[PDB]
Amino acid sequence: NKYNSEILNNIILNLRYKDNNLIDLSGYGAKVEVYDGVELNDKNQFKLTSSANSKIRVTQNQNIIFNSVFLDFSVSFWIRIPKYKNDGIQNYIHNEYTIINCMKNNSGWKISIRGNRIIWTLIDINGKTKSVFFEYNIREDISEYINRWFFVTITNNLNNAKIYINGKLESNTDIKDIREVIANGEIIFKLDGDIDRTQFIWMKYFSIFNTELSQSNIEERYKIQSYSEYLKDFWGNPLMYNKEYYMFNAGNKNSYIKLKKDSPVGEILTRSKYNQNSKYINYRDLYIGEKFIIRRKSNSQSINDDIVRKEDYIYLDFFNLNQEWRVYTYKYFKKEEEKLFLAPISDSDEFYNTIQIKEYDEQPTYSCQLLFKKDEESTDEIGLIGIHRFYESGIVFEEYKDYFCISKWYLKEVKRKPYNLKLGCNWQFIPKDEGWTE
């Protein structure tokens, strides 16, 4: 409809990937210099490292007779900040480093990071300062932010500086007392401060607007830049085939899958937690439970790797001590839910092995759903993969226990609006990542 141009309104700088480089497609033609230390890929993601040559310099229109200033302006971008090093806590919490700086005659703005806090700073013509920040908890079991791509938007008008995270307002600072801010300085993208040589930042879709973006407009941009045909992993990157993944359940965040001893089923256990005793941090381990791997079903030709897309037909396997086993459901079960069947790769006609990976959520998410159908062409849906607490009435036992299950119930629950985010049928895949050490 070319009606999707709405999120381009008032844009004055739009950094985009093009021919192994970054260029401003705003139409105002800013000069962009990307140095050799900046890693760039087609997916619009760029990485800033500790290297001196890891920087980006953007030059804007020069102001000859008068000073160029902003009244209302906004800054948009996605970012992924790696988790702190357990052995480098002090440096993480105390050393602030600039990631992006835009100033001329000591006036302008900048974005800096101090540990788990992202900071927006304004400096007027007098040197007067004002800051608004977003800090995410580092003592939480499962963080929605640490080492995961998330959307940032900072808007400014003459009275308030607001920080929006993932389309929602998180912080606000009264800036009425701050004066004019020089806006045409060079914009330097580069890590600057006393940082660990291993520190890095990933950023994507950096843009500036010469207006105060509305929440409504920010939400739409959030939705549009979150949209993709491929599914994503726990970190927000594209989901792939033939890649080792630990499985996470949105509905039961502190649980993981473990092949139950002496059984062909997966039991659900509680995640181990940070063992040391730092008073600053806490988290549940993520690299635990069975190591799963997604294999392409339909047309399996020399599968070495690749991207998983919505509606793809797959095989959900996992390694049982070097051997690659598979996840199945019995073609027959009468309970509302039953235990999934874990076993070697076979063609048995006693159970279903084909899964279709879906996305029932209409809003941005990194979760997906796993559905077993009679077959690819059939519309008879068997059930969705999830977690359910069964009742093990032993002759003396009398105990309830969580199992990796399939459920007929979910099939109707995923239909309810708004889409249920708390469902135990929402999964996320976690691959080892340099940004997360435990």
Curated annotation (Swiss-Prot):
- Annotated consequence of substituting residue 410 to S: Greatly decreased toxicity, heavy chain has decreased binding to synaptosomes and dramatic decrease in GT1b binding
Q: Please tell me, according to the UniProt entry, what happens when changing residue 346 to Y.
A: Increased binding of heavy chain to host SYT2, no effect on toxicity
Which segments carry the region annotation C-terminus of receptor binding domain (C-RBD)? 227-438
Q: Which domain of life is it from?
A: Bacteria
Q: Where is this region: N-terminus of receptor binding domain (N-RBD)?
A: 5-226
Residue ranges annotated as coiled coil are none
Q: What is the effect of changing residue 330 to R?
A: Significantly decreased binding of heavy chain to host SYT1 and SYT2 independent of gangliosides
Q: What is the effect of changing residue 388 to W?
A: Greatly decreased toxicity, heavy chain has decreased binding to synaptosomes and dramatic decrease in GT1b binding
What residues bind a ganglioside GT1b (d18:1(4E)), as annotated?
172, 336-337
Motif residue range(s): Host ganglioside-binding motif: 407-410
User: What's the protein's topology in the membrane?
Assistant: Multi-pass membrane protein
Per the UniProt entry, the effect of residue 339 to E is:
Greatly decreased binding of heavy chain to host SYT2, whole toxin about dramatically less toxic. Significantly decreased binding of heavy chain to host SYT1 and SYT2 independent of gangliosides; whole toxin significantly less toxic
Domain comment?
Has 3 functional domains; the translocation domain (TD) and the receptor-binding domain (RBD) which is further subdivided into N- and C-terminal domains (N-RBD and C-RBD). HC forms channels in bilayers at low pH. The N-terminal belt of the TD wraps an extended belt around the perimeter of the LC; it is shorter than in BoNT/A and does not block the active site. The belt may be a pseudosubstrate inhibitor which serves as an intramolecular chaperone for the LC prior to its translocation into the host cytosol.
Q: What is this protein called?
A: Botulinum neurotoxin B heavy chain
Organism for this UniProt entry = Clostridium botulinum
Q: By which gene is this protein encoded?
A: botB
